[PDB]
């Protein structure tokens, strides 16, 4: 039982992208203060709660409504945009409740763009520290590093939809590996071994389609701009290899071995594969490195 919880406006929009893109392994929950924007959410479960301190007390006042929604989950994803009042303060509370209930809590959050001002960057920094305390592992993508990812052509009014896509890839990276119906999935106990109480995590994404797509997508994930460091400093590595119906076990093994050779000699590496047939010839390699 996996649940991804979008906290705040930006977090809700990512969840809505997470649903438009096929991701049915998981139960979706949306939490916000703005009721109208909650009605425009696509998640099954919606919870209205109620400067990042309003968000906090709103979440704490709705502790039991949040507790009820998460009930039964084994792992929970809390995705939010840090910076605003709602997500920055409420998302650490939703995470801390999830971790108290025994769920493996994974935070996938964003730092705002530089063009959003220092105050929004200052509050986001405090939210990030709050979330690190709350979750098992936290993935933080600074929105500024999408400029090292997006096209020269990217419109400025499209900028927050690429943020949605990156948060989609963070959650779907791990979520697709654990409970899809086509079961060459991994074992949950081993996932816990890589995520539990670790803290700060890196994410690498690589896409390719050639004859040597496996080697190419793995090298590009190893050196994805989203990684702030090389994964060599990492103790545990969770790797996802998503392909179409032509994805081979050899290709997965090849890509896993390339990543494992870049990690620390005695990393704890677990990897799995996901067949999604909308993808034709391109494979996507997602690497999650933990413990920093
Ligand atoms: N991925 C994504 N991020 C967004 C989006 N909109 C804003 N963000 C980022 O997330 C940060 C917080 O924005 P919101 O989530 O809308 O703020 P909030 O949580 O609703 O808090 P409030 O101020 O009470 O509305 C902003 O600084 C942006 O950097 C979005 O649509 N998608």
Numbering used by the authors: 13 to 62, 74 to 315
Q: What's the paper's own text on this?
A:
FtsZ is an ancient, filament-forming, tubulin-like GTPase protein found in the vast majority of bacteria and archaea, where it acts as a central component of the cell division machinery (1–3). Here, using X-ray crystallography of Staphylococcus aureus FtsZ (SaFtsZ), we reveal how an FtsZ can adopt two functionally distinct conformations, open and closed. The closed form is found within several crystal forms of two nonpolymerizing SaFtsZ mutants and corresponds to many previous FtsZ structures from other organisms. We argue that FtsZ’s conformational switch is polymerization-associated, driven by the formation of the longitudinal intersubunit interfaces along the filament.
Specifically, two SaFtsZ mutations, F138A and T66W, were designed to inhibit SaFtsZ filament formation on the basis of equivalent mutations inhibiting the assembly of Methanocaldococcus jannaschii FtsZ (M164A and T92W, respectively; polymerization inhibition of T92W [unpublished data]). Both mutation sites are located on the “top” surface of FtsZ, in the N-terminal GTP-binding domain, and are part of the longitudinal protofilament interface seen in crystals. Filament formation in both mutated SaFtsZ proteins was compromised, since no filament formation was detected by sedimentation or negative-stain electron microscopy for either T66W or F138A in the presence of GTP or guanosine-5′-[(α,β)-methyleno]triphosphate (GMPCPP), a slowly hydrolyzable analogue of GTP. We solved five crystal structures of the globular domains of SaFtsZ T66W and F138A. For easier reference, the five SaFtsZ structures are named herein in the form #XXx: number (1 to 5), mutation (F for F138A, T for T66W), monomer conformation (O for open, C for closed), and finally the arrangement of monomers within the crystal (m for monomeric, f for filamentous, single protofilament and s for split/domain swapped). In contrast, we present four crystal forms where, for the first time, SaFtsZ is not arranged in straight, infinitely long filaments. The crystals are therefore composed of pairs of poorly interacting FtsZ proteins that pack via further crystal contacts that do not resemble interfaces in any way. The pseudointerfaces have a subunit-subunit BSA of 670 to 800 Å2 and look similar to the interfaces seen in the closed T7 mutant structures, only including residues from one side of the top face. We know that our mutations compromise filament formation, and we obtained crystals where these mutant SaFtsZ proteins adopt the closed conformation and fail to form bona fide interfaces. Hence, we propose that these closed forms correspond to the conformation of monomeric SaFtsZ in solution.
